[PDB]
């Protein structure tokens, strides 16, 4: 991995290949590791970059423990600028990664050549859309959350295995556990749970997400929507997937998987993203 | 103790006596407990209020783990407004409590009848000014701080006993460690170490503290400076105590103690504050 100072911390990142950039943004509680089997379908047709968000993966931590969505936006902005990823960017995004990439395309659309997204935060959430996850996420946003996320590491020990159809090896789980050895190291996972805009709160993230939803639903940026079956956030019959399916200049591809679909169908995801990237580069 | 909702958390506070308000503000890593033997010298001549800052004492925690100085400013502002402590207020402040009270004085001087302060943050600091705390406070502002503050709870187990001349009882230490049973509960103590403006950094805190320093050094608000012998932040020979003695309309008293002087001379402190308060109310 490479590494670069960002603000008061340091961000590690995968950087393999040549050409126009293809940026892979992970979510909670994962890292660039999640993309390991998808990137090889792309590293001969583009410069693949996959950063670990601050406090996650192999990256540095926030010395002020500033782990809100706004903080991650600032850290990732600093990373884009430091590395020079400002022209003809294909974003490949998932979970909070989508929120970060969507927001970036909102503010710098001239820099974005295309967006491929999966189980994404496409608009502010409602509790109905959480379906199977509603009791857990609700509890994480009450005072129980400190125990569940920090003392019990629930995202790594339960959400990750729950969100994969196949059985993870012990080495895979060891990799996912590596950034989070102590309760005081797991604050980013709790914050990501508490930052989700659900029916108005938190109001600042709700505003940012509403803004990029309003923009992307009218933006002619080329898009690939990868839908997992049965999926999680974006699922058949759900209001959020319906909204995503309204977006313009968009193609859709279906693959097998739950929330962490990369662990179940990486080759199909990589093949779809590769067709997309070639198509997008054709019209530059 | 009383308790009131403030922003997204809840603040516990002592509220005893009646009449014009006298507000006692503690710093790192203490709580209103620090004033327990000072308030009885005042509660027959004023409404004494002593809030525990968010994440400390008996108060609720910050669900987003937002523990910077500006966050505490917002939470304490919400307390001031909810309890309506906005007229004829005498501030009795110490350590980071002083920064908060000073900053309140800066923005709403019409609400402030007088300020009694001890071992306070009167202006941005220099590393020399730290004297024998310099090794600790340098280390905490490096990557070792997480181990020292979160894993070892250095501020409660070491800094508090080291800042009192007498030996603290078992019950006293049991109280002081009550908010901090786990590493993930100790984030406020580390944030407080990292937020001190030292030689320009952090720059936002430095701007705030410089602003209230410029203001208070020229303000005619009545002041009582309680100087501890030998003290810690405000010591003989130091530039910070010299600047503090620059401040107008001020009376100075001396008592025995180190940083946590309330634990060694609470009756002297209480008598000085009571005298100051009665004078302030007589002139108002």
Residue numbers in the entry:
A (entry chain A), B (entry chain B): 1 to 284
What sentences appear in the manuscript?
Haloalkane dehalogenases (HLDs) are α/β-hydrolase fold enzymes that catalyse the cleavage of carbon–halogen bonds in halogenated compounds through an SN2 nucleophilic substitution mechanism, producing a corresponding alcohol, a halide and a proton. However, DmmarA differs from the other members of the HLD-II subfamily as it contains an aspartic acid instead of a glutamic acid as the catalytic acid in the catalytic triad. The overall structure of DmmarA shows a canonical HLD fold that shares major structural features with other HLDs.
Crystallization screening and subsequent crystal-growth optimization identified two chemical conditions, at pH 6.5 and pH 5.5, where we could reproducibly obtain DmmarA crystals. The asymmetric units of both crystal forms of DmmarA (pH 6.5 and pH 5.5) contain four protein chains (A–D), of which chains A and B form the first biological homodimer and chains C and D form the second biological dimer. The active site of DmmarA is located between the main α/β-core and the helical cap domain. In the active site we find the proton-relay catalytic triad, which is atypically composed of a nucleophilic aspartate (Asp95), a base histidine (His259) and a catalytic acid (Asp119). Careful inspection of the electron-density maps revealed an atypical mode of DmmarA homodimerization that has not previously been observed. Precisely, the DmmarA structure displays a new so-called back-to-back homodimerization mode, distinguishing it from the previously described HLD dimers. The DmmarA homodimer is assembled due to noncovalent interactions between the L5 loop located in the main α/β-core, the α5′ and α7 helices in the cap domain of one chain and the corresponding symmetric interface of the second chain. Our crystallographic analysis, supported by nanoDSF and SAXS experiments, provides evidence that the DmmarA enzyme forms symmetric homodimers, predominantly due to the specific composition and conformation of the L5 loop.
